[PDB]
Amino acid sequence: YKLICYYTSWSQYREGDGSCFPDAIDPFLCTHVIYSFANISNNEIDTWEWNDVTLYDTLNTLKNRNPNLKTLLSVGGWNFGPQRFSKIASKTQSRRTFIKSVPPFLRTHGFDGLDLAWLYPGRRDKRHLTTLVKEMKAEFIREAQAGTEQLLLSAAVSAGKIAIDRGYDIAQISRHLDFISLLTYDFHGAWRQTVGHHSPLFRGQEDASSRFSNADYAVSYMLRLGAPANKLVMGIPTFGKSFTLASSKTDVGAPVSGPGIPGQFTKEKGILAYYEICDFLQGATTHRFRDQQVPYATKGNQWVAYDDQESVKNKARYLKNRQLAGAMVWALDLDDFRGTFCGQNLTFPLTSAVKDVLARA
C-alpha cells in the first residue's frame, strides 16, 4: 500500500516548536513524500521559497537512510491562481515550454516525480488538463530513454462531485497518472453559515442534502467514472476546521458566525494543526458523529471538527476494504511531528496510525 505524505515549505516559518523542516521527517514513515509548492515563472517550473534549493536537498537526503523512499515536487497549490494554470495549459506553446522544463529541474534537485496541484479546473479547462497530463507523461517516457528510472506523475484532485464533473476527464487522465490523490477533506468550511464536519467518511442517515459530501461517495463516484482502484489514493487530513459559534447551540446544525480564532502556532483562522487540537482538547467537550465516523470538540464559543487516531484508522480500513492504492496525508507538518503535544510518546501519531493499519493484511 502507498502512504503519500505532503510537506509544506511555509511550515518552516512557524514560531517555536511549530517550526518544521524536512529534517524532522521519519524516513521510514511514508512511501512517498511530496514537497509542496513549486512555482511557474516564464512558463518554466521554478522554486518558490528563497531557501527551497536547500530544503530540497535536506528532504532528498532522507533517501540516504531509506533508499526505497520516493520524493515528488508538487506544482501549483492554493496560493497559485488557477487562472495561471489555465493560461499555461490553454496554449500549446506555453504548455510545451512548461513540460520541457520539468525533467531537468527534477533531475537537478533529486526528485523522483512531479505532482500536479491545479486547484481546480473549470469547465473551460477540462480539455487542456487532459492535454497537460498526456504530454507531460509522454515527455517523462521519452526522458527515461536516457537510462534513468522514469519520472512519476501524480495529481491531487477534488473530491467534490460538481467540481469533478466540471473540470476533469477522469477516464482519460487516469491512464496517464501513476496515482491520483483524492482531496476527501474539504466537504465544508466557513462557506456555509452553519457547523459541519469537513471530512466525514459516510453520509450519515441524519443529513440528506449533500449526500455527495463524504469520502465514501467520492470514492464510489471516481470508481464509477473509470479511475482504477489501484491508482486511487484517499486523502486523510491531519488538521481540523474551527468555527466561532453564534449561539450556545453545539449539536449538528448549530449557527456559526465565522471561522474559529487562529492557533498559537499556525496562526490561520479556520484551521488548527493536530498538535494544536491536542492542546485544545484539555477542557473541551468531545463528541463523535457515529454516522459519519468522525469527532468534533467544543470549548466556549469555539467548535472544532477534526480527525483522531480512531477516525484515521477507520478511514484506513475503509480504503483497504475498497482495495484502493493507499492513503495520502495532508501535511506531516500539521501532525504532532515533535511528538510532544499529544500525550503518548510518539512522533506523527496520526500518520503512524494510518501506516499501522496499512501494514496489516
Ligand X SMILES: *[C@@H]1O[C@H](CO)[C@@H](O[C@@H]2O[C@H](CO)[C@@H](O)[C@H](O)[C@H]2NC(C)=O)[C@H](O)[C@H]1NC(C)=O
The binding site for ligand X (CB under 6 A) comprises: 39, 41, 48
CA–CA distance from 30 to each of 1, 42, 63 (Å)? Answer: 10, 33, 12
- How far, in Å, CA of 274 to CA of 11, rounded? 14
**Closest distance between ligand X and the C-beta of residue 51, in Å?**
12
Mention every residue, 6+ apart, whose C-beta is less than 8 A from residue 254: 194, 195, 245, 246, 247, 303
**Closest distance between ligand X and the C-beta of residue 125, in Å?**
17
Q: What is the DSSP letter of 113?
A: E
* CB-nearer residue toward ligand X: 39 or 194: 39
* CB-nearer residue toward ligand X: 118 or 187: 118
Cell 476527464 locates to 169
Burial (0-12, 13-18, 19+ Cβ within 10 Å), 175: middle
Structure-block grid coordinates of residue 343: 500525550
* CB-nearer residue toward ligand X: 48 or 168: 48
**Closest distance between ligand X and the C-beta of residue 318, in Å?**
37
Using Cβ positions, the residue closest to ligand X within the complex turns out to be 41
* CB-nearer residue toward ligand X: 41 or 145: 41
Q: What is the DSSP letter of 151?
A: P
- How far, in Å, CA of 245 to CA of 272, rounded? 16
* CB-nearer residue toward ligand X: 9 or 292: 9
* CB-nearer residue toward ligand X: 48 or 179: 48
**Closest distance between ligand X and the C-beta of residue 266, in Å?**
20
**Closest distance between ligand X and the C-beta of residue 41, in Å?**
3
Distance of CA 136 to the CA centre of its chain: 21
- How far, in Å, CA of 217 to CA of 164, rounded? 12
**Closest distance between ligand X and the C-beta of residue 57, in Å?**
19
**Closest distance between ligand X and the C-beta of residue 47, in Å?**
7
Q: Are 199 and 305 in contact (CB under 8 A)?
A: yes
* CB-nearer residue toward ligand X: 13 or 28: 13
Residue among 292, 274, 350, 354 at smallest CA distance from 319: 354
